[PDB]
Amino acid sequence: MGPGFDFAQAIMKKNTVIARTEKGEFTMLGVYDRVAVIPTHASVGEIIYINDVETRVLDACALRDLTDTNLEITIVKLDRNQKFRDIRHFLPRCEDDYNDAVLSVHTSKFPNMYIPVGQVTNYGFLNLGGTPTHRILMYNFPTRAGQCGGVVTTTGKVIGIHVGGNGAQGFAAMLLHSYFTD
Numbered sequence: 001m002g003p004g005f006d007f008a009q010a011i012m013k014k015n016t017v018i019a020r021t022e023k024g025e026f027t028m029l030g031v032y033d034r035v036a037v038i039p040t041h042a043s044v045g046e047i048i049y050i051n052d053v054e055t056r057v058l059d060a061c062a063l064r065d066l067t068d069t070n071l072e073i074t075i076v077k078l079d080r081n082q083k084f085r086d087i088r089h090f091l092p093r094c095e096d097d098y099n100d101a102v103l104s105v106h107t108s109k110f111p112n113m114y115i116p117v118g119q120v121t122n123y124g125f126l127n128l129g130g131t132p133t134h135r136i137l138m139y140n141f142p143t144r145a146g147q148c149g150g151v152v153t154t155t156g157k158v159i160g161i162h163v164g165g166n167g168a169q170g171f172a173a174m175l176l177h178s179y180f181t182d
């Protein structure tokens, strides 16, 4: 409907797949080569379904900060026959607050879904499902089951992936450029 939705749609159309684990179907952001991200609570194993294709997992790393606190991001390398467009130049370098973000989701349950979530706070610490978590972004939208892994963007930046909510607020894990230096 506007330039925010334009950027979000460009990311969804080329850099997302539908990931299925034993814990559910998730929006999965492809970042470069065969490397993607997903919430850690997806519990990625040795095998994952990618757009309903059985796919070997070459590597999976559940990220933690240097205080050894959960970040809720798993980086997955997929045994896929095709690379993602490299979008690392759209990742922020530092923790920040943002204006006018979009949360985009693509699954069987929620195809081509885009939500204007407005202002995004650098919230920091969250007890996420009982797990102390750092680098959380917060937005005031009543996000639901089915939106986990959803991409959070502004115009020109891919800033986070949706990991939870409390009925009134939604919470995303930050994506930082430094996670994807190879």
Ligand SMILES: COc1cc(C(=O)O)cc(OC)c1OC
Pocket: 003, 006, 007, 010, 011, 155, 156
């Ligand atoms: C349609 O929105 C954009 C898409 C892309 C892209 O390369 O996908 C790059 C942009 O910045 C130059 C955009 O504007 C912020």
